[PDB]
């Protein structure tokens, strides 16, 4: 994969290091099977007894040397994990602040909390633990396999037949079975998705029943259906796979091909001990390296997902309140058009309202105002200047936004009015607070303007909503977008939030995302958006006269 | 465990006796085989190889029993892992509907999707692949113990106190490795969760202009932190190491022993060779064991989700407009009492309302009467006839509801409405049709009520899919009629379907509503306002919006807000 080795670039000497130690060790794990081996070459022999207390002292010298290095290399892989982790993290932090603001907003991928604190640790386990784990998997059977081939070629050749003999069976099932195969993951997604239905749909199923309670079982009975019928047929072969690779069958292997040998005079007797000793189980070693890859594998993947995060675009900047937008078409996706070839323009202290059902890219049009993404054609100009070489400094306090789903920052109540200003005084937060109308709130919490708040706080969201809207009080923005959805977000709310509303946009320019069509009458131009793309513009008087789409959309309200 | 046993079929009792008996005999013909090696290797290195045949006889004689009696393990194994999924499947599907739905806190939910889903496999191989090698190898070395005990009893006593040291030393180390993966994640959420309060708070802090100051902070707290990460250490350093170091500093002192024997003269050298071979055969399964660690904790884990599941807390059990009645019914969810003091006796026919704010608890009451949960306390009853000594299928045909979310099973609008009374015929379902209004949702829609209104299917905004509800609601011949409250005012044909299920209901049935808005709260008979479950006012319509309580500022707030229009005031 190109994405994983990029990633992981810094690391390329560290973790081959950690292989060539990783196979020394376990090279060193498999010497004292050798040592009984010569133990019993000297007992064969009549040795004296200091070659025996010798070769039984080297047999403790490596198994301490085999777990001093064991813990004296990861224990330095450790560090290495860490000064690696730690300037991932922090270019994760870095790249967080120059990504473009939509990328937050979620597009049905994978979370922000998954996609950095699940996938960190991944890695830290593919650092620390899949790589040094596979590579003893991969070097003690390959190893052992050299061995048991110079010891005796002949025995040790004997071992391929349960090999064969599991790897034939494979095959043979395998292609057997490939159409159940290919539907099986298939299928597990689809009994997940009919499991989550049935549990979130579960009141509809538990007070009226029938076809919606009967479905989920029909179909869970074709799920176990279909795992019945596709492994059923296959008893005889699973079981003889699983005899041939026991160690009991590998032991009465070995004797049978080496007992004649043996006996016959055919071989030295005391060359079959490393047969017994080790190729016993080698048989269960081989089937360890599936494992150890799959650990690689999963920790690649997260590898991956981190890599595309720090590899996605950033918000490039380039080069009396007034608005312009001319001919923009943006698109979430190639091929997929939201908005096309729209034209609009607002006058200095106007309000405007994007209006349709069948939304047609209205709050990717409002969001596209504070630019959460760049247009792929045409430009839209605050005061004359492109937005596109607006910086935050600038761009920021030109559009002031607030949109739904206003997030909290962690800190005193006054500060989180003041993050736009911190340097407003006490009397200029209380008065924003007045005018977004969430001074009464704050006066009832216990201490007051003193009182922190964060993700763990008692506020409701319109009350949160009300202090994003005095925050946007206090930074006054000329230029807004917003969206009508904050209004009847939470309808007990709905009189301040209105009131709040109302105050920030008197005097200040506008553009809403407009949903309730009883909620704009005095709006300077009302549009409406359909396939798209524009399809009428107006008042709400005129268009009301013209009697277009507007006109059926009230109608029908 | 006891719960692996528990989720057996009643039916496999002689299955599952004949799997231990065909185990325990598997673990004879092979722990015997291995001690038979002591005879074989002893005459194989000895002056006599010509005395192997004998021994390699009655190896081969039990190798071929162990093969037979192995395949009769195995294909009973499948036989068992077939029917356990299968019966532990069907009892979680029966039981789920039974369950209360106070039991799906959300990683309770999704604790029951993945045993649902992501287990079918795997309890199809659980018998197979982790349950026969974990006995096979956990049996063994005390096996081979035992049968080095009644011949040769020096030496057996020796294994068989070693094998307490041996599995002291893998669950010692099993013990630490899970630990430290513990602490590793621990540590590494500890660190990025600054990261994560970043992302969060981008939008707020981009827009203020200080997201660079922001970002300077958490690096340099990230920086400030990242220093401590190594003294932790001393956990992970005896992980697996400890368990080989045990391994074989046990192997070299048994065979240490062997050889202080033979220099005393109390052994043979072939005699002291094949003691050495089997006290390395006695060894490898416990190798066997510590590779086989992983399956089996997952497999702890899926059986942890699955009894959970199973012992979840389930509802006991046993045509004109019935009584309603709560007597001092109270009910709490979490770690608050979402229903406080309720109590009424609703006479029957009438229709009813109930508002208050949002997360009040004004929803549970209507799963109360519902019978989605039951009462911790009091008593909920229809007629007298207490819901939870109601019988089960009668229990299902007292009640209808239409929900804040309005729920639809992917199906078309004739399909999904149909649901509550399938045998109705078309001319109730067309008049259900008129009286929700849907059907002007049926000029819009392409192919009338034939077209598919799944999640996937129509982009149904919330009023129109509430609408259909109501048709649903209104079809089935329910002696009791429940509406909830998520009426957007997008929808207005919504408000009006609504007030006709207030007014223009032909059936009889008792009628209770759940109301935020002007048109919900209108033609009530009376209004239960919630308040934090607990139910502040009840009274009448124009006794409560006259005598300036509660729900007249409510009402009062709620209609000057409709009233706004945007550009003025
Ligand atoms: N989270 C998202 N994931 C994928 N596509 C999206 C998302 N949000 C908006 N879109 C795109 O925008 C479209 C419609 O415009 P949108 O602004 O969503 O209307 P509304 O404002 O009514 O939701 C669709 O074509 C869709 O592809
Ligand atoms: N399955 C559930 N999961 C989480 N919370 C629940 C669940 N069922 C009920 N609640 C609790 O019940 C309260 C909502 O009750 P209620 O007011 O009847 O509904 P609504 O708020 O939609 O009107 C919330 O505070 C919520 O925490």
């Keep these: ?557 | 465990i006891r719960t692996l046993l528990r989720l057996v079929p009643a039916e496999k009792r002689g299955a599952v006796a004949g799997y231990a008996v065909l185990t325990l005999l598997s673990v004879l013909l092979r722990a015997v085989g291995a001690v038979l090696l002591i005879p074989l290797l002893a005459a194989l290195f000895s002056d006599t190889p010509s005395d192997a045949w004998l021994w390699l006889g009655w190896l081969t004689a039990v190798t071929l029993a162990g093969w037979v009696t192995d395949t009769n393990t195995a294909r009973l194994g499948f036989d068992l892992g077939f029917a356990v999924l299968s019966r532990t499947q069907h009892d979680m599907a029966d039981r789920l509907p039974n369950v209360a739905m106070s039991w799906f806190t959300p990683d309770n939910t999704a604790t029951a999707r993945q045993a649902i889903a992501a287990t079918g496999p795997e309890l199809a191989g659980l018998v197979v692949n982790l349950l026969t090698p974990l006995i096979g190898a956990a049996l063994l070395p005390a096996a081979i113990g035992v049968a080095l005990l009644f011949v040769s009893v020096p030496l057996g006593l020796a294994a068989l106190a070693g094998v307490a040291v041996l599995f002291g030393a893998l669950a010692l180390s099993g013990r630490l490795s899970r630990a430290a993966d513990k602490v590793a994640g621990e540590t590494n959420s500890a660190f990025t969760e600054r990261i994560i309060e970043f992302a969060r708070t981008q939008q707020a802090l981009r827009a203020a202009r200080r997201v660079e100051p922001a970002r300077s902070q958490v690096g340099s707290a990230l920086a400030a932190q990242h220093g401590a990460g190594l003294r932790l250490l001393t956990m992970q350093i005896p992980g697996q190491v400890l368990f080989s170091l045990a391994g074989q500093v046990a192997l070299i002192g048994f065979a240490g022993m062997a050889v202080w024997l033979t220099v005393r003269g109390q052994l043979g050298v072939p005699e002291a060779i094949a003691l050495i071979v089997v006290l390395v055969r006695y060894l490898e399964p416990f190798a066997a064991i510590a590779d086989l660690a992983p399956a089996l904790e997952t497999t702890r884990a899926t059986l942890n989700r699955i009894q959970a599941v199973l012992d979840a807390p389930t509802l006991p059990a046993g045509g004109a407009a019935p009584s309603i009645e709560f007597d001092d019914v109270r009910f709490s969810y979490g770690d608050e009492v979402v229903l406080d003091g309720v109590s009424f006796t609703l006479r029957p026919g009438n229709t009813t309302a109930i508002v208050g704010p949002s997360g009040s608890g004004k929803t549970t009451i209507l799963s109360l009467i519902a019978g989605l949960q039951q009462p911790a306390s009091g008593r909920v009853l229809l007629d007298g006839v207490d819901v939870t000594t109601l019988d089960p299928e009668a229990r299902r045909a007292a009640v209808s509801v239409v929900f804040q979310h309005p729920y639809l099973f992917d199906g078309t609008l004739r399909d999904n409405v149909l649901v509550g009374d399938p045998e109705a015929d078309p001319d109730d379902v067309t008049a259900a049709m008129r009286l929700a209004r849907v059907d002007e949702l049926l000029d819009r829609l392409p192919d009338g009520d034939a077209t598919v209104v799944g999640e996937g299917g129509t982009a149904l905004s919330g009023g129109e899919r509430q609408r259909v509800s109501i048709a649903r609601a209104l079809l089935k011949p329910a002696p009791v009629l429940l509406v909830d409250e998520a009426t957007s005012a997008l929808d207005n044909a919504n408000e009006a379907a609504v007030v006709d299920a207030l007014t223009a209901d032909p059936r009889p049935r008792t009628r209770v509503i759940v109301a935020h808005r002007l048109a919900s709260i209108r033609h009530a008979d009376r209004v239960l306002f919630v308040e934090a479950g607990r139910v502040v006012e009840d009274g009448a319509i124009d006794e409560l919006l006259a005598a300036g309580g509660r729900f007249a500022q409510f009402w009062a707030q709620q209609q000057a807000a409709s009233e706004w229009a945007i550009g003025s005031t």
């Excluded at chain 1, 790249?95 to 049905?108: A, D, E, H, M, V």
């Excluded at chain 1, 830290?124 to 081939?149: E, G, K, N, R």
């Excluded at chain 1, 005391?270 to 999963?298: D, E, H, K, M």
């Design chain 1, 1 to 557: 994969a190109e994405a994983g080795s990029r990633l992981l670039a810094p690391l390329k000497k560290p973790l081959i290091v950690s292989g060539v130690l990783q196979a020394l060790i376990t090279l060193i794990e498999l010497a004292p099977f050798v040592l009984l081996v010569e133990l019993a070459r000297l007992l064969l022999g009549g040795a004296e007894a200091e070659r025996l207390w010798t070769l039984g002292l080297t047999a403790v010298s490596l198994i301490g040397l085999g777990a001093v290095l064991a813990a004296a290399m990861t224990l330095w892989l450790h560090r290495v994990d860490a000064r690696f982790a730690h300037e991932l993290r922090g270019r994760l932090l870095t790249k967080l602040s120059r990504l473009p603001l939509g990328w937050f907003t979620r597009r049905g991928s994978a979370s922000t909390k998954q996609l950095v604190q699940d996938d960190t640790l991944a890695l830290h386990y593919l650092i620390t633990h899949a790589i040094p784990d596979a590579v003893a998997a991969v070097v003690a059977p390959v190893a052992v396999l050299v061995y048991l081939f110079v010891a005796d070629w002949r025995v040790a050749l004997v071992l391929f037949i349960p090999v064969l003999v599991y790897l034939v069976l494979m095959s043979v099932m395998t292609i057997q079975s490939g159409s159940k195969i290919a539907q099986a993951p298939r299928w597990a997604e689809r009994m997940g998705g009919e499991a989550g239905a049935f549990l979130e749909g579960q009141p509809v199923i538990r007070i009226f029943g029938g076809a919606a309670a009967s479905r989920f079982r029909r179909r869970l009975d074709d799920y176990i259906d279909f795992l019945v019928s596709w492994q059923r047929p296959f008893v005889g072969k699973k079981t003889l796979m699983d005899l041939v690779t026991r160690p009991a069958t590998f032991l009465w292997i070995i004797l049978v091909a080496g007992v004649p040998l043996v006996v016959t005079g055919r071989m030295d007797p005391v060359n079959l001990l490393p047969f017994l000793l080790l190729g016993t189980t080698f048989g269960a070693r081989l089937l360890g390296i599936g494992y150890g890859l799959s650990g690689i594998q999963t920790g690649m993947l997260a590898a991956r997902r981190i890599q595309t995060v720090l590899d996605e675009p950033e918000l490039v900047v380039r080069d009396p309140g007034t608005v312009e937008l001319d001919r923009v078409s943006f698109e979430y996706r190639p091929g997929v058009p939201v908005i096309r070839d729209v034209t609009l323009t607002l006058r200095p202290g106007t309000v405007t309202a994007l209006v349709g059902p069948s939304g047609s890219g209205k709050s990717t049009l409002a969001a596209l105002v504070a630019r959460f993404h760049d247009v792929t054609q045409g430009a839209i100009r605050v005061d004359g200047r492109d937005i596109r070489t607006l910086t935050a400094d600038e761009l920021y306090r030109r559009v002031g936004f607030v949109l739904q789903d206003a997030q909290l920052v962690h800190g005193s109540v006054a500060e989180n009015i003041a993050l736009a200003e911190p340097d407003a005084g006490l009397e200029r937060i209380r008065t924003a607070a007045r005018d977004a109308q969430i001074h009464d709130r704050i006066t009832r919490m216990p201490d007051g303007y003193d009182s922190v708040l964060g993700a763990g706080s008692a506020l409701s969201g319109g009350e949160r909503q009300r202090v994003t809207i005095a925050r946007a009080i206090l930074a006054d923005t000329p230029v807004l977008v917003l969206d009508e959805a904050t209004a009847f977000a939470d309808p007990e709310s709905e009189y301040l939030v209105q009131q709040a509303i109302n105050r920030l946009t008197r005097d200040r320019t506008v553009l809403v995302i407009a949903h309730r069509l009883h909620t704009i009458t005095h709006a300077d131009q009302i549009v409406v958006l359909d396939d798209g793309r524009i399809v009428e513009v107006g008042t709400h008087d005129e268009l009301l006269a013209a009697g277009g789409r507007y006109r059926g959309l009230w109608d029908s309200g």
